[PDB]
Every structure is written in C-alpha cells, then in structure tokens.
Enzyme design. Sequence first.
Site, PDB file in Angstrom:
ATOM      1  N   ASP A  13      35.345  21.719  48.575  1.00  0.00           N
ATOM      2  CA  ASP A  13      35.313  20.682  47.526  1.00  0.00           C
ATOM      3  C   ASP A  13      35.294  19.364  48.294  1.00  0.00           C
ATOM      4  O   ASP A  13      36.289  19.042  48.958  1.00  0.00           O
ATOM      5  CB  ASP A  13      36.480  20.825  46.562  1.00  0.00           C
ATOM      6  CG  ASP A  13      36.632  19.722  45.518  1.00  0.00           C
ATOM      7  OD1 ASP A  13      35.674  18.996  45.261  1.00  0.00           O
ATOM      8  OD2 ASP A  13      37.734  19.618  44.966  1.00  0.00           O
TER       9      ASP A  13
ATOM     10  N   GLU B  21      30.787  21.409  40.222  1.00  0.00           N
ATOM     11  CA  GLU B  21      32.260  21.419  40.146  1.00  0.00           C
ATOM     12  C   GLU B  21      32.696  22.200  38.910  1.00  0.00           C
ATOM     13  O   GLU B  21      33.625  22.991  38.997  1.00  0.00           O
ATOM     14  CB  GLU B  21      32.783  19.987  40.308  1.00  0.00           C
ATOM     15  CG  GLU B  21      32.536  19.511  41.745  1.00  0.00           C
ATOM     16  CD  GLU B  21      32.569  18.016  42.065  1.00  0.00           C
ATOM     17  OE1 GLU B  21      32.960  17.287  41.203  1.00  0.00           O
ATOM     18  OE2 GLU B  21      32.197  17.601  43.203  1.00  0.00           O
TER      19      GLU B  21
ATOM     20  N   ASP C 119      37.886  17.097  33.936  1.00  0.00           N
ATOM     21  CA  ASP C 119      38.231  16.994  35.367  1.00  0.00           C
ATOM     22  C   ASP C 119      38.707  15.574  35.627  1.00  0.00           C
ATOM     23  O   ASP C 119      37.857  14.634  35.716  1.00  0.00           O
ATOM     24  CB  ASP C 119      37.042  17.421  36.217  1.00  0.00           C
ATOM     25  CG  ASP C 119      37.258  17.333  37.715  1.00  0.00           C
ATOM     26  OD1 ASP C 119      38.195  16.601  38.148  1.00  0.00           O
ATOM     27  OD2 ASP C 119      36.481  18.008  38.442  1.00  0.00           O
TER      28      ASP C 119
ATOM     29  N   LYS D 257      31.280   9.219  48.566  1.00  0.00           N
ATOM     30  CA  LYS D 257      30.621  10.108  47.592  1.00  0.00           C
ATOM     31  C   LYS D 257      29.980   9.247  46.505  1.00  0.00           C
ATOM     32  O   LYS D 257      29.028   9.718  45.895  1.00  0.00           O
ATOM     33  CB  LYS D 257      31.627  11.075  46.966  1.00  0.00           C
ATOM     34  CG  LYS D 257      31.032  12.052  45.971  1.00  0.00           C
ATOM     35  CD  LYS D 257      31.965  13.186  45.709  1.00  0.00           C
ATOM     36  CE  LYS D 257      31.548  14.018  44.522  1.00  0.00           C
ATOM     37  NZ  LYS D 257      32.448  15.184  44.372  1.00  0.00           N
TER      38      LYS D 257
END
Length: 377
Positions: free
Chosen positions: A7, A172, A194, A68
């Site tokens: 992850d 994800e 999330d 990211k």
Amino acid sequence: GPVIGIDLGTTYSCVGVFKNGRVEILNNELGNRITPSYVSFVDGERKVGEAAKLEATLHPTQTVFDVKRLIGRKFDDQEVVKDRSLLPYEIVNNQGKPNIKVQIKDKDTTFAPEQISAMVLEKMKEIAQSFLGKPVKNAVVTVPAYFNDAQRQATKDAGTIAGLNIVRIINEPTAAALAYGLDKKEETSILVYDLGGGTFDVSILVIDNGVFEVYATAGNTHLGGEDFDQRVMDYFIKMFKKKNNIDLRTDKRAIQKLRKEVEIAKRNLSVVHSTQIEIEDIVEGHNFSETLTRAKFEELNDDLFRETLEPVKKVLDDAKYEKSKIDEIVLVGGSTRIPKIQQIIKEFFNGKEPNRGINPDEAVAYGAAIQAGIILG
Ligand SMILES: Nc1ncnc2c1nc(N)n2[C@@H]1O[C@H](CO)[C@@H](O)[C@H]1O
C-alpha cells in the site's frame, strides 16, 4: 521468487508478505507497521520514513512528502496548482510535469515524483527482504480507483526504479474487499469509505462472480485525520494565547510537540471520553496542561465529519444507486475508528451497520498481499 504487497498511501506506506498460508504485515526498523511516506535531503544525508518526517519541522523545504498527489499528473492541472501552494518544498515545471527540487550539499537537484516514490518502495522492499531472508523483485502495489493510465504507469515506473517488477496494480477498494474476504460468488455492491491521514475516498465496488469493478468514486483530496488534529491544535493555540499571552505558532518546535500529543489525544478519545494533553516546558517556563473531551473533539470537527457524506451522495448519484442497493459498507483508514464517523455513516444508511476491521490502516496492504498469493497460486 516471492511477490510482496505494498500500500503506497499518500501519508504512509505498508508492506505485507504471504508466507505459510498467512499474511504478515511487517514492522519497519522502528517497530511500526505503517511508514510515513517522507524523504528528507538535509546535510548531505537522505532519510526515508519517520526519521525524514522529523526533519520537516526545521527543514521544511528539504523534506518531501505527499508525492502521491503529484505522480503521473501535469504541472498545470488544477489539483497540482493547489498542491504547489500547500506544499513547502519547491515543485518545478519539467516539460509540463511536476518535479521536486531540493539541495544536496548545496547543489540544486530535481526528482520526478516516481523517483521519490521509488525511495519509499525501496525501504518497503528492504523490510520484506530482511524478513523473508531472500531477494524480492516482484510486488502487487495499490493505487486509488480514480488513478488514470499515466498515474498507474508512473507508479509502475517507481517500482522499476526501486528494482521491483509491479506484476499487478490493484485499486485500494479491491485490496480492501480482498482483505475483508468479501464473498466473490454471485453479485455484491460494496461502499468502500476510506478515511486516511490526508485524504478521503469513497467507491462503489461491485463484485460479480469473482470479477471486481469500481462503478463510481468520489472524495475530498484534503480531508483526513491530520485535519481533525489541526482543528484541535487551533483550539488549544487560541486558549494558550488567551491564558498566557504566548502564541505557540511563534515556535515551530512547540507546534511539533503539541501536534504529537494532540494525535495521541484524538486516538484516546476513540476509546475514552476524556484525556489529558501534557507537554512540560512546551516553551521554557510554560507547561501545557489541558483536558479534551470526546464531545469537544466532535464539536471542533463535526462540519468535516459531515462533509464526508457529500462524496457518499455523489457516488450513489453517479451510479444511479439508492442507499438500499448497498449490501455492505466497509471502512478503511485509522480515522474510521472515530465513533462519530461510524455513527454518521450508519444513520446516513438509514440504520445499516458498517464493517471496520481492527487494523484499518493495514487492510489495503493486507489485500495487496492476498492478491500476491492469488497470483502465485
Ligand atoms: N484511534 C484512532 N482514532 C482516530 N483516528 C485514528 C485512530 N487510529 C488511527 N490510526 N487514526 C488516524 O488514522 C490516520 C491514519 O493513520 C491518522 O490521521 C491517525 O491519527
């Protein structure tokens, strides 16, 4: 060879292995299962993880994070423009693409985002190699469901630089569904909520006879746990000024120490109703000693908690779904431990209970590890 699961999160990364029929989420050298996605370039040393994160306070321009947010994007995308204004390290325009600029021994040095992400991948790879006592050349790496081809390719390129063949990119939400082992048989519609340290993502994942498809995604790129901590810090900075005529924002070191204690206090208030935030000599001659209740924690953040339902409504609308069509709500990210978050989601879903692992920060890496095992057979 082995295939590990990573992850690669906005604020953190997590590595898992599948060995002897179990997933093991691995500790870093400091004994944590989560590594801050930070790289620092100070005094001719490179650091990765918490050691880099700690340089952020005194060396904000040399301390790189949130990469990211940049990977596979263009310098002029509205989102990158907003990030250049939020991020304290220099972002430069390399032929239409954001690059990071820092100094190493005073020398101007520019990195592609995928080169910094490669340094996080390198460290996760080294945790896996020392645990398995074997070289690791292959990985399953996760991305957000909204990632486009260039954002996925830029993540693969990060792998290549780290000496990792990314055998499969999985979103994800899919990784979460694999971790929670959602039945692959017949058809299931899942809301994956999330809530991380830095970002909020919600997806409608539909599982059909072992085929996973994300039908819709929405989110808030600047809403997570770190915002809830900042609301608490703002409150106590105001109070300390009122009480002591000291503005703690005038001392970077004071703010760092407060932020650390406030993060722990928030975590405490997911279990207890009242907690002490204490720093001896937050500046010389002045102790910080305060109580925070769950009720005040909630009051300070209730508009942000409530904001998380706007993306929920958008995905239901985008997929022309009614609340009822959702078979299971799955929660990912440590921020979903906040009771009020769980409560607000439940009441939105007209009484329906949501599912929250017990290590919600590790579910995505766990799922990536399961995907690695699935691919090995
Ligand atoms: N007990 C808890 N209560 C509230 N928030 C919690 C939390 N545990 C985590 N990890 N978080 C937050 O999750 C994010 C990702 O690690 C961070 O912002 C943590 O503080």
